[PDB]
Write an enzyme that holds these catalytic residues in place. Structure first.
Site: not given
Ligand code: SB4
Ligand code: OG2
Ligand code: CA
Ligand code: CA
Ligand code: CA
Ligand code: CA
Ligand code: CL
Length: 345
Positions: A26-27, A29-34, A164
Site C-alpha cells: 500500500v505504498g 513510508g518514511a524510510y520504508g515501505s508499507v 511522519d
C-alpha cells in the site's frame, strides 16, 4: 517463539510472524515501505512498515531509533502509534531488519478531497482531528515540519491520523514559509500554517499556493497575506533574500472573505488566524481547538496532551552499533497496548 514466513513484496523479501497474513503493498513510508495485513490474533487490519536498510550508516541507524522511540511514545487517537514492532532476528548479532505495525488506514487526505465536494461539517471534522493530533505532539515538544495531505492517514469513516512527524521530490505547497525559506528561528506553529493551506484546499477544492519554485510560492503567499514588515526580515539570514523581499512592490493583505467566497464565516476567521507570516502571532493548535468553527466537535475532556518525551538522545553522536543496540532494546521492551483503550465519556 513465533514462527516467521518469507514473502517477496515490492521486489524484496519480507519476513513476518505467521500472525500477520494476506500482506499486500500500500505504498512507501518514511524510510520504508508499507503493506496492509490481517492480524489473525485479533481479526484487525494492520499496516506493516518494513524499514529500508535501517542500520546502513549512522544516519539510518539514528533515524531508525528516532522513529521507534517516537512511535512507542505516541498514544493518541489522531496520531500514528504502534500495535507491534518485530524483527526476524533472534539476537542483537543477527539484528538488521525492523518492522513497525499500526492500525490500517486505507487512504490519505488527497483521497478524501479529490472526488468529493466536502460539506463544511465534514471539513470541520477533518481539520479538528488534525489539530487534536497536533496539540498532542506539540505538547511533547515534537513538531511535524512537513505536514501535508499525503502525511494524513484517513480511514473509510474519515477518521484521521498524523504520520511522519518528528523526522524523491516533495511538495512544498503546504510548508510554512519559515521552513521553506530556511529562516533563522521558528516554533511549533509551522504546522499551523500547513493546516491553513490544507483547510483552504478542502474548502475550495483548489491548492492555495501552487508555486512552481520557492520564489513563485513566496509571491503567491505574499499576494494573499500582504508584504511583511521590516521586523520579519530579522529572521532571514541571506542578504540576497532580504534585499529581494524588501525590493518587492508593497502589497496589501487580501480580505479572506473575498478569497473564500461562500465559505462559513467562522472558517474564514480561522484561516485568517492560521495564515499569518509572523509565527509568534499564529494561532496555536490548542487555541484553534477552542475556535467556534469546531463548536460541534470540541470537547476539552477528549483533547489530551502527551506524557513528557525525553529527546536527550538527539544531541548525541553514537556509533552505529550503539544506535543498533539501543534500537534492539526498544524492540524487546515494547509492550503492546490493550486492544480496547477507550471508555464512554
Ligand atoms: N495504509 C496505512 N495505514 C497506516 C499507516 C500507513 C503508513 C505508514 C506506517 C507508519 C508506521 C507504521 F507502524 C506502519 C505504517 N507509513 C506510511 N504510511 C502511508 C502509506 C501510503 N500513504 C498513506 C499512509 N499506511
Ligand atoms: C490554484 C487555484 N488558484 C489560487 N490558488 N489562486 C490564488 C489564491 C490566493 C493565494 C494566491 C493569490 C490569490 C489568492 C489567488 C493564489
Ligand atoms: Ca466527546
Ligand atoms: Ca473506534
Ligand atoms: Ca471501550
Ligand atoms: Ca465529559
Ligand atoms: Cl519517554
Amino acid at each position: 517463539r513465533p514462527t516467521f514466513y518469507r514473502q517477496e513484496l515490492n521486489k524484496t523479501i519480507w519476513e513476518v510472524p505467521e500472525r500477520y497474513q494476506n500482506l499486500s503493498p500500500v505504498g512507501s513510508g518514511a524510510y520504508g515501505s508499507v503493506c496492509a495485513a490481517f492480524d489473525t490474533k485479533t481479526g484487525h487490519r494492520v499496516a506493516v512498515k518494513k524499514l529500508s536498510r535501517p542500520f546502513q550508516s549512522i544516519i539510518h541507524a539514528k533515524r531508525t531509533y528516532r522513529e521507534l522511540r517516537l512511535l512507542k511514545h505516541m498514544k493518541h487517537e489522531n496520531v500514528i502509534g504502534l500495535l507491534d514492532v518485530f524483527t526476524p532476528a533472534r539476537s542483537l548479532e543477527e539484528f538488521n531488519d525492523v518492522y513497525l505495525v499500526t492500525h490500517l488506514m486505507g487512504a490519505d487526505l488527497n483521497n478524501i478531497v479529490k472526488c468529493q465536494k466536502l460539506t463544511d461539517d465534514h471539513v470541520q471534522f477533518l481539520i479538528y482531528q488534525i489539530l487534536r493530533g497536533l496539540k498532542y505532539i506539540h505538547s511533547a515538544d515534537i513538531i511535524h515540519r512537513d505536514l501535508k495531505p499525503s502525511n494524513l492517514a484517513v480511514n473509510e469513516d474519515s477518521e484521521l491520523k498524523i504520520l511522519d512527524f518528528g523526522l524523491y521530490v516533495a511538495t512544498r505547497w503546504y510548508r510554512a514559509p519559515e521552513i521553506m525559506l530556511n529562516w533563522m528561528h521558528y516554533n511549533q506553529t509551522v504546522d499551523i500554517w500547513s493546516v491553513g493551506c490544507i483547510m483552504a484546499e478542502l474548502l475550495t477544492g483548489r491548492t492555495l499556493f501552487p508555486g512552481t519554485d520557492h520564489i513563485d510560492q513566496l509571491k503567491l503567499i505574499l499576494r494573499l497575506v500582504g508584504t511583511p514588515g521590516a521586523e520579519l526580515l530579522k529572521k532571514i539570514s541571506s542578504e540576497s533574500a532580504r534585499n529581494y523581499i524588501q525590493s518587492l512592490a508593497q502589497m496589501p493583505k487580501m480580505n479572506f472573505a473575498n478569497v473564500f467566497i461562500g465559505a462559513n464565516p467562522l472558517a474564514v476567521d480561522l484561516l485568517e488566524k492560521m495564515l499569518v507570516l509572523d509565527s509568534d502571532k499564529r494561532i496555536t493548535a490548542a487555541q484553534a481547538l477552542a475556535h467556534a468553527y469546531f463548536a460541534q466537535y470540541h470537547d476539552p475532556d477528549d483533547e489530551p496532551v502527551a506524557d513528557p518525551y525525553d529527546q536527550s538522545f538527539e544531541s548525541r553522536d553514537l556509533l552505529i552499533d550503539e544506535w543498533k543496540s539501543l534500537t534492539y532494546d526498544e524492540v524487546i521492551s515494547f509492550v503492546p497496548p490493550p486492544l480496547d483503550q477507550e471508555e464512554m465519556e
